[PDB]
């Protein structure tokens, strides 16, 4: 049954500055500027509140499927507020039994070379997504640190450098090797 109104409301903090050209929410803050066009959802985004303390989304006459697109939007806008005010840090470890996974960062973080994965001679080169800066960290024997503003980019480049290192034609229950995302977090704390 079509519901008359279904709406939510993200609460912007005073530190962020947000505007929208229709369904194109642009969010500017301490770390950058992120824009995510929502022209494929058919809702009403209102930048209500003076000084724009909050953003309110409305779906009028929406079936059950379209009522889902409400909280999805309100969660992407809060993941842009978060990735613009704090950042996205995808700390990830490397698990190897015998052959050490020798990883190296080129191009100032926009490319990763993985050598000696399972003692192979193929050097996996993985181009990062534009905006995602990988860097070997310290205090941890073998791990990487991915950093960025857009969670879709950070998480997808982590899925790229995780799926690149997969075991083939073996028993993936015994051959537990790879570069797995251990911790999802933020650049600066809160």
């Amino acid at each position: 049954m079509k519901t008359i109104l279904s709406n939510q409301t993200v609460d912007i903090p005073e530190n962020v500055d947000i505007s929208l050209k229709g369904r194109t929410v642009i969010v500017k803050g301490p770390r950058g500027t992120l824009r995510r066009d929502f022209n494929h959802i058919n809702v009403e985004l209102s930048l209500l509140g003076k000084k724009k303390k909050r953003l309110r989304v409305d779906k009028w006459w929406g079936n059950r499927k379209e009522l889902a697109t409400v909280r999805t939007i309100c969660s992407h806008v809060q993941n842009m507020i978060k990735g613009v005010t704090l950042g996205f840090r995808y700390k990830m470890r490397s698990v190897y039994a015998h052959f050490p996974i020798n990883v190296v960062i080129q191009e100032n973080g926009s490319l990763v070379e993985i050598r000696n994965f399972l003692g192979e001679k193929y050097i996996r080169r993985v181009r990062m997504r534009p905006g995602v800066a990988c860097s070997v960290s310290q205090a941890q024997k073998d791990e990487l640190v991915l950093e960025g503003n857009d969670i879709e980019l950070v998480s997808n480049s982590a899925a790229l450098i995780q799926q690149a290192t997969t075991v083939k034609n073996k028993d993936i229950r015994k051959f537990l090797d790879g570069i797995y995302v251990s911790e999802k977090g933020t650049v600066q704390q809160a």
């Binding site: 049954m1 519901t3 008359i4 109104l5 058919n42 009403e44 009028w60 006459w61």
Partner: protein
């Protein structure tokens, strides 16, 4: 039956035939919804024959009148007690509607069992219609209109009369 047009709301009474034994039998009122009195008397006999040991030949129709609405200018909440058959079994139901007339809400119930359950007009058997207070309704599709300050926009006004300007210069507008 066939729920043609809009159904009227008929009040049919009828009695068995007088005999030497029962010098006068009891009258039996029913509350039929049908296109016209000719179909209303036939559903009166369908029902009376399914309840009492009484047939159209063995009886007579004492009165078949249309009962109008007592407030056709007040939006009401009608609740109906269906009884219908599917391809496998027969089920009782209870459906609610917002309408102005009782026969209106019953027409909307025939078109609703037709839409949702593909039940032809002859499988359905209305057994009780009752105007319900807004605080006794159950279906959330009907409770949602019980608001005093209701407010909503018509958001995607698709252009009708697509063929009067059939060949036009400007493109259609849907925001209004």
């Amino acid at each position: 039956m066939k729920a043609s047009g809009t159904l009227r709301e008929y009040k049919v009474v009828g009695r068995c035939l007088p005999t030497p034994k029962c010098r006068t039998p009891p009258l039996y009122r029913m509350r039929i919804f049908a296109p016209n009195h000719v179909v209303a008397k036939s559903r009166f006999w369908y029902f009376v024959s399914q309840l009492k040991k009484m047939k159209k030949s063995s009886g007579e129709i004492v009165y078949c009148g249309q009962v109008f609405e007592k407030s056709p200018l007040r939006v009401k909440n009608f609740g109906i007690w269906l009884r219908y058959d599917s391809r496998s079994g027969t089920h009782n139901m209870y459906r609610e509607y917002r309408d102005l007339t009782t026969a209106g809400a019953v027409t909307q119930c025939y078109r609703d069992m037709g839409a949702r359950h593909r039940a032809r007009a002859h499988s359905i058997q209305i057994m009780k219609v009752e105007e319900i207070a807004a605080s006794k309704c159950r279906r959330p599709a009907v409770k949602q209109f019980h608001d005093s300050k209701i407010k909503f926009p018509l958001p995607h006004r698709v252009l009708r009369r697509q063929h009067k300007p059939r060949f036009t210069t400007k493109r259609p507008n849907t925001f209004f």
